[PDB]
Design a binder for this molecule. Structure first.
Ligand SMILES: [Ca+2]
Ligand SMILES: [Ca+2]
Ligand SMILES: [Ca+2]
Ligand SMILES: [Ca+2]
Ligand SMILES: [Ca+2]
Ligand SMILES: [Ca+2]
Ligand SMILES: [Ca+2]
Ligand SMILES: [Ca+2]
Ligand SMILES: [Ca+2]
Ligand SMILES: [Ca+2]
Ligand SMILES: [Ca+2]
Ligand SMILES: [Ca+2]
Ligand SMILES: [Ca+2]
Ligand SMILES: [Ca+2]
Ligand SMILES: [Ca+2]
Ligand SMILES: [Ca+2]
Ligand SMILES: [Ca+2]
Ligand SMILES: [Ca+2]
Ligand SMILES: [Ca+2]
Ligand SMILES: [Ca+2]
Ligand SMILES: [Ca+2]
Ligand SMILES: [Ca+2]
Ligand SMILES: [Ca+2]
Ligand SMILES: [Ca+2]
Ligand SMILES: [Cl-]
Ligand SMILES: [Cl-]
Ligand SMILES: [Cl-]
Ligand SMILES: [Cl-]
Ligand SMILES: [Cl-]
Ligand SMILES: [Cl-]
Ligand SMILES: [Cl-]
Ligand SMILES: [Cl-]
Ligand SMILES: [Cl-]
Ligand SMILES: [Cl-]
Ligand SMILES: [Cl-]
Ligand SMILES: [Cl-]
Ligand SMILES: [Cl-]
Ligand SMILES: [Cl-]
Ligand SMILES: [Cl-]
Ligand SMILES: [Cl-]
Ligand SMILES: [Cl-]
Ligand SMILES: [Cl-]
Ligand code: NA
Ligand code: NA
Ligand code: NA
Ligand code: NA
Ligand code: NA
Ligand code: NA
Lengths: 175, 175, 175, 175, 175, 175
């Protein structure tokens, strides 16, 4: 199942991301159920917004919210929910939501999948529009849902992203 | 796998539905294979019709046709085949087909997924057009397939739907 | 999982094909990972081309490239990645790529799924345009990827396709 | 505008069809307004059905219902509403609806657009499934609309189709 | 052309709306050019948002921003840009943007197109979620565009909507 | 109509492009008919290829093939056939086809539509993958059509593109 996919070939540089939500999709918030490996509908989002990138997680990690760490993956074409993409972390958007600190990593397709993102080595190489769109999305996507909310704290670099990967990988290792 | 998803958090009021066919999709009749949990193509439907709602089943139930009980789930946006949605039963369309009585439950997204359907408490709260579309779909979707056919028997309420859930859950329990 | 799906009800005449890529889709080359059964992104294809048919494989087979044997399945509407379709082999396009001989079977939906393809009994019954499109696709889809390439060797009949099925089924049987 | 498009290069053998509704589309019944040439929504159809082919009309014709003659055009991929396709008539489905006799021509893409349909010379060469789907569609698409209804009278050949073209062209000529 | 479409059969009760942007579409802000009647790209919107309803205007009106009055039209399925739908006004969202007061009417499909919206007689009958989504959309869709901004002032009823229609119709009449 | 759209606000720097074919679309080759301004189907393309960018023309120009000059426009999301986008030329792919020299301009969305392409000032700033995809597309898209063919001659800069615009604008001016 999706439950059995590694965190990565060589974390934190070389990771796999399980996709839950495609870029530019209908506002259905899918989440993989850890017990079954199945894709569940968490909610029908209430704002008229879409994820700027594919959205998913790194398996065999545990963030402080109790779920695997959250990752955005830009691609040339939207990915299928439940698919897995090999990627390389390049930055992280720090934020707190209704449950606490819950960072949003950005990882680009690995060179072996495409050469398109090889020039993106660190967070400053991400397009400014994309970064602003991501920040705006997380600032506002919960605006019409009672008891959900976000404080966006700012962009940090690839080293920071990799530290978060390692930390949440080690957290799951000793659960 | 999808094989391991509960029938519900608290049946029959609070159920999970495994989706096989999205609303308003191409006429591919997918079915989950009970042995593998994989999505198989049962047939390419022959009429130029689409399911008015997402279509799927409640796991760990057994109807008289030998399959898990059939459920229609209206949503704001079509769901992915193989995904699972938490729902609440609100009515049932009774019918017989070429194999016998094989009712079609209607269950709406659970309040925790959306508030949109909370006002739908019983079958009379479903839109009349939607109910008529569902009835017409099942009356006609087999019209061009030899040895497939339907007799639609009528709409019944949420209590009737819940009774069917319990009955087919208990049937699977002792198989 | 998809790992547990038979090669066929009655190979080589009656087979199942696990779909990885839909017909006429975005240029994402998905592949099922044999370890996990999950759909991985192999690459983002570099040419502006699409598969003329759904593309996938027969489980529990092993071709000389180390993967299960490759199958194209024409359908009236594109199939979902990760779904399984019952089919009947009708021809094969022989070719060598950067790793060696790696034939592309064509199998049509089984009569039980549709009557649409029953008249296609052998390779000469496939539409000429479709065959030419398939040949052209494999001749060119790697043209912009370094270290990937193809030599198309020609169309052969249904008996040849069935021989390839049996051979790669027997190869996996003794791995 | 679309108002100024010829009926055909060489009617009735060589015609243009203005497309109003794509094949396999959402149930929005678009119609070109004769005054403005704009695409208007006639209605949101009430049954869960789709047109088996693109649907439109031959400009500068007048059928007995007061509109230009109705044409179905099968294509490999759905056409855009408001686009124009060169075609060749091959058959006609005779029927009466709530307003009277209102035949449905079938015309295939002209050889200059594609070779795919050149083998379809007359109504017997159309696929049987497609013809049955068209007949079933018109028999049922008005089933949930009060004061709309259909009596399907049967398939006739290409000569009959061409006669209808000429007759409605001549009708518009002297309005 | 679209330039020649009436404001309505019987304004302000019975209007036509020219659609520029479909509901739930990609973030391309199309606008009809008054000179040519063609659909121009005004901009590629910068936030990750979509219009909750189809969006367009009433022809032969002039609002204070210099364009025809703006209308949102909910439908069961998204409409084609450049198409025209007969509708009935039911409410208005008052707001000011970077150019001044520029209200957003809501008009539902006319009864002759569908019975689905007949129960919506006034603004209080619109779903609360939809109204909140519309308000949130206009509050935020310009958030990442320099020199574009919005102050949302509040919902008013069908009479207010009709007054705005009449006022901008009369404004265009004497330009 | 589309017939009445200017070549540009300030040619050759500031142009309008009428879109005929969206990026990444089905293989329907639409063309605007100069007489009617309507979108006609020229052909159903025979290779399994798609245009890497939106494709269209500059109105009120005449190239040596007798049609207005051909332009590719990259956008974040595909454009609607028949829509018009303001753009800025940045390069040109020179080639000859079955009718003669028939260059393919590349023009990016004008700064007023988006800031995304402002950094693309000349042909060397276009992504290498995109340029290679465009070249490969034109080298191969006619490979399965008798009496259609292409010789790609190479990329030239923005000044060359602008010269071609001016030349074909002046050609149409004196027809
Ligand atoms: Ca989308
Ligand atoms: Ca998450
Ligand atoms: Ca969270
Ligand atoms: Ca999280
Ligand atoms: Ca659909
Ligand atoms: Ca079932
Ligand atoms: Ca049944
Ligand atoms: Ca059943
Ligand atoms: Ca496609
Ligand atoms: Ca393979
Ligand atoms: Ca290979
Ligand atoms: Ca292979
Ligand atoms: Ca469709
Ligand atoms: Ca008609
Ligand atoms: Ca009629
Ligand atoms: Ca008619
Ligand atoms: Ca959309
Ligand atoms: Ca406007
Ligand atoms: Ca405004
Ligand atoms: Ca306005
Ligand atoms: Ca596409
Ligand atoms: Ca051209
Ligand atoms: Ca040419
Ligand atoms: Ca040309
Ligand atoms: Cl791991
Ligand atoms: Cl993306
Ligand atoms: Cl990498
Ligand atoms: Cl259970
Ligand atoms: Cl639904
Ligand atoms: Cl509930
Ligand atoms: Cl097996
Ligand atoms: Cl196919
Ligand atoms: Cl068979
Ligand atoms: Cl004419
Ligand atoms: Cl069609
Ligand atoms: Cl012809
Ligand atoms: Cl008027
Ligand atoms: Cl809508
Ligand atoms: Cl009304
Ligand atoms: Cl001009
Ligand atoms: Cl593009
Ligand atoms: Cl510019
Ligand atoms: Na909130
Ligand atoms: Na039947
Ligand atoms: Na290569
Ligand atoms: Na009726
Ligand atoms: Na702003
Ligand atoms: Na050729």
């Amino acid at each position: 199942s999706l439950l059995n996919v590694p965190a990565g070939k060589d974390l934190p540089e070389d990771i796999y991301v399980v996709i839950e939500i495609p870029a530019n999709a209908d506002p259905i918030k899918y989440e993989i159920d850890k017990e079954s490996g199945a894709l569940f509908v968490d909610r029908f989002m209430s704002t008229a917004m879409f994820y700027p990138c594919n959205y998913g997680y790194i398996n065999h990690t545990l963030s402080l919210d109790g779920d695997p760490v959250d990752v955005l993956v830009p691609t040339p074409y939207p990915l299928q929910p439940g698919s897995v993409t090999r990627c390389r972390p390049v930055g992280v958007l720090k934020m707190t939501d209704e449950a606490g600190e819950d960072a949003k990593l950005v990882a680009v397709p690995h060179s072996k999948l495409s050469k398109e993102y090889d020039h993106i080595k660190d967070v400053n190489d991400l397009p400014e529009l994309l970064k602003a769109q991501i920040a705006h999305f997380f600032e506002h996507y919960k605006d019409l849902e009672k008891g959900k909310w976000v404080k966006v704290e700012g962009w940090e670099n690839a080293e920071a992203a990799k530290a978060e990967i390692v930390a949440s990988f080690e957290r799951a290792k000793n659960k």
